[model samples]
Target: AGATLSRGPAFPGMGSEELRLASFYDWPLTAEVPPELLAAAGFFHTGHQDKVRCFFCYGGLQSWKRGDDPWTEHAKWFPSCQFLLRSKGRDFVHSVQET
Candidate 1:
């Protein structure tokens, strides 16, 4: 079950992408990944490692690599996440999932 309409920070206090980004100040930076991409992909720092959780689906995406796509991966991980579908479109999810 995922929310389709809520453009949220997922976590209560994290309402905006900029707000969500503030959580990453102390988080170890990923040399390959930037803070903007994470927040844009609806993710916020978990204060543990380089991992982040989506505000809507709460999916924990870690396994960092050289720019492992955020929006693309989120579609595969949480197919039910409506926010992703709306953002990328069913066409994107359909094409990506045709792996």
Candidate 2:
């Protein structure tokens, strides 16, 4: 175990209460999106054209990665993710290398 920081929503319940909640998607909009596109976007594309685009894509890009398309941020909702960061040493405040 290590020092933990909850920067984003740690519970699904937090989103339900807010009408301005952002969508968390397990897939992307189009099938044409390349694997690299998916990798770069840090999202998966289910390759189903029939699937409805999740509310997440509607919001401006959640990914800060380079070469990603910019999605305009919705004023109503905040998009976020839950991440587990592991660090050595007692120091809890720190940063990580982005791959």
Candidate 3:
């Protein structure tokens, strides 16, 4: 079995990160936070009230504050996501949870 866990549906249509980025084009506040950062974190804008869902996990994050960083929010909210663990390591993800 693959070690990577996929707890949610995959957006195969938006295969690339750029594709994922494109979905955020209509987001109300693109300047508040970088869409690319969210896309790089495997999130695509759901276009439903600032909601974004990750590619590798079923977790969806919304209500992003101005100071919110995608990676930290991703690790904090969807801590079990495989993408976050591999990109940042479990230690870092766990550390993020504490703060």
Candidate 4:
């Protein structure tokens, strides 16, 4: 049987057991920037990856200070997914609003 267990991004140094324990007792379910925007971006009917870029992950591990990096240090707070979503969503909304 080949099964793989996955974990979300966890606090540093917290093992799987510790994370699970924390989830049971101390973990808090909080809203992280609503996924509505992300979902809308995903459902958006655009065929242009070239026009959008991820805000966080696209750059280097920590930054894109080096020359000609693929990632740009744009919205540093938003994740790559959110960044892309925001970019495309803004364009879509603007186009609709204009029309």
Off by over 4 Å in 4: 1-28, 43-99
Prediction RMSDs, each to the true structure? 3.6, 11.5, 3.4, 16.3
Cα TM-score of candidate 4: 0.17
TM-score of each: 0.79, 0.23, 0.79, 0.17
Alpha carbon lDDT of residue 73, candidate 3?
Answer: 86
Which sequence of candidate numbers ranks them by lDDT, best first?
3, 1, 4, 2
Best-performing candidate as measured by TM-score: 3
Best by lDDT: 3
Task: Give the per-residue lDDT digits (tens) of candidate 2, residues 15-59.
Answer: 331322222233434433333333332232223331222223322
Give the distance in Å from residue 14's predicted Cα in candidate 2 to where it truly belongs: 23
Clash count, predicted structure 4: 0
Candidate 1 lowest-lDDT run of ten = 3-12
Alpha carbon RMSD to native, model 4: 16.3
Clashing pairs in 4: none
Candidate 3 wrongly placed segments (more than 4 Å): 1-9
How high is the CA lDDT of each candidate model?
0.76, 0.28, 0.80, 0.28
